[PDB]
Amino acid sequence: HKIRVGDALLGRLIDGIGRPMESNIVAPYLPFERSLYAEPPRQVIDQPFILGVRAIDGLLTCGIGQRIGIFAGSGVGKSTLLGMICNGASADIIVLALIGERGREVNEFLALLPQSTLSKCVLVVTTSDRPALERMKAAFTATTIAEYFRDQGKNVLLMMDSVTRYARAARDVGLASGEPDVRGGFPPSVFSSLPKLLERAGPAPKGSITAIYTVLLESDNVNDPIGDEVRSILDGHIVLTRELAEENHFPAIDIGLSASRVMHNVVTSEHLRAAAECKKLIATYKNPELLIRIGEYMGQDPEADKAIKNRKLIQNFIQQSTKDISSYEKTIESLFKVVA
Numbered sequence: 001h002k003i004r005v006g007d008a009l010l011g012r013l014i015d016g017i018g019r020p021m022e023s024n025i026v027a028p029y030l031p032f033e034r035s036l037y038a039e040p041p042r043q044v045i046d047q048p049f050i051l052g053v054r055a056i057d058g059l060l061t062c063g064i065g066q067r068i069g070i071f072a073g074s075g076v077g078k079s080t081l082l083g084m085i086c087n088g089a090s091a092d093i094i095v096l097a098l099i100g101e102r103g104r105e106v107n108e109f110l111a112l113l114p115q116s117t118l119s120k121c122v123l124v125v126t127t128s129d130r131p132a133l134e135r136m137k138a139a140f141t142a143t144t145i146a147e148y149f150r151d152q153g154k155n156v157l158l159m160m161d162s163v164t165r166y167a168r169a170a171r172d173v174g175l176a177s178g179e180p181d182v183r184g185g186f187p188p189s190v191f192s193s194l195p196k197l198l199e200r201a202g203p204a205p206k207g208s209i210t211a212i213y214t215v216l217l218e219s220d221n222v223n224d225p226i227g228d229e230v231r232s233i234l235d236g237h238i239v240l241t242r243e244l245a246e247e248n249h250f251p252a253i254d255i256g257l258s259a260s261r262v263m264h265n266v267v268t269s270e271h272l273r274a275a276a277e278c279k280k281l282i283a284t285y286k287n288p289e290l291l292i293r294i295g296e297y298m299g300q301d302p303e304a305d306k307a308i309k310n311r312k313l314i315q316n317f318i319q320q321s322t323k324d325i326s327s328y329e330k331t332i333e334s335l336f337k338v339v340a
C-alpha cells in the first residue's frame with residue numbers, strides 16, 4: 001500500500017488511507033507516493049519537548065523523539081488533555097490519528113482546536129463505522145505522514161488516539177485472514193506490529209517525531225495484553241484516574257502513577273530537584289480536618305507541614321484549565337515557587 005502525501009495535507013481531514021474527506025471541488029496537490037511500511041532504521045534523547053501542560057512539563061518532562069503513553073479510562077478528561085497538548089506543544093507539525101470513536105466524539109475533540117492549531121495539523125480520522133482494514137491502516141498512514149514532515153526538517157508531534165483501537169482493528173483484520181487467538185483474543189500479527197509502529201518515532205538528523213499513544217482503560221479487571229506490550233516499550237507514561245477526575249481535578253494526572261524515563265536527561269539538576277520535592281509534597285498531603293477533628297495541633301513533622309502550607313500553590317500548578325496557556329519559562333518559575 002502506497003499513499004499520496006505533500007504539504008497540502010496540512011489543515012485537512014484525511015481518511016485512514018490518506019485521502020481527503022472534505023467537500024472541495026479543487027483537489028489538493030499531493031505529488032508524492034510513499035509506502036505505508038517502513039523497515040527499521042541511532043540517536044539519543046537530550047532535548048525537552050514542551051507540551052504546555054504544567055504538571056507534565058514541570059514534573060514528568062518529555063523529550064524530543066520520545067514515545068509517550070497516555071493511559072485513561074472513559075470520562076477522565078482524556079480528550080481535553082489531548083486538546084491542550086495540541087494547542088500548547090512546541091511542534092512545527094501535528095499529525096493526529098483519531099481511530100475507532102464515533103463521529104460525535106471526534107467533533108467534540110476538534111472543537112477544542114482553534115484555527116491556528118488546525119492549520120498545522122494533519123487529521124487522520126477513522127470512525128468506528130469504517131472497515132477494520134481502514135482503522136488499522138490509519139496508524140501507518142499517520143506515522144508515514146509524520147515521517148514525510150520530519151524529512152522536511154520539521155519537529156513533528158504524532159498523536160495517536162488510540163493504540164488500543166488501532167489494535168482492535170488490527171486484530172479483526174488478523175483473525176479474518178485465519179490467524180488464531182494467541183493472547184486475549186489478539187492474533188500474532190498485532191503483537192509483532194506494535195514495536196514496528198513505535199520504532200518509527202524518534203529523534204533524527206533532519207527533524208524529529210515525538211509520539212503520544214493513548215491506551216484506553218476499561219472499567220473491568222480484564223487483562224489488556226496490548227497495554228502490557230506498550231508499557232514495556234514506552235519512554236514515558238501519563239496516567240489519568242477516575243479518582244482525580246471525580247474531584248474535578250484536571251488534568252486528572254496521577255503523578256505517582258506517571259513517569260518520564262528521559263526527564264533527568266533533559267532538565268537541569270535543580271529542576272529535577274524541585275520536581276522530586278513537589279512530588280513528595282503531593283504524596284504526603286493529608287486533609288488538616290483529619291487532625292483538627294481529633295483535637296487539632298506539630299510536630300516535629302516538617303515535610304507534611306509544608307504540604308499544607310503549599311497546597312493551594314501546588315494544586316493551582318498541577319491543575320490547569322483548557323485555555324490557561326503556559327510557556328516553559330513560566331512553568332519552571334512556578335514550580336520553584338510551589339516548593340518554597
Ligand SMILES: Nc1ncnc2c1ncn2[C@@H]1O[C@H](COP(=O)(O)OP(=O)(O)O)[C@@H](O)[C@H]1O
Nearest residue numbers: 074075076077078079080081250251320321322
Ligand atoms: N483540563 C480541564 N480544564 C477544564 N475542564 C475540564 C478539563 N478536563 C476536563 N474538563 C471538563 O470535563 C469534561 C470532560 O472532558 P473530555 O476531555 O471531554 O473527557 P473525555 O476524555 O471523556 O472525552 C470536559 O467537557 C470539561 O468540561
Ligand SMILES: [Ca+2]
Nearest residue numbers: 223224225228
Ligand atoms: Ca495487564
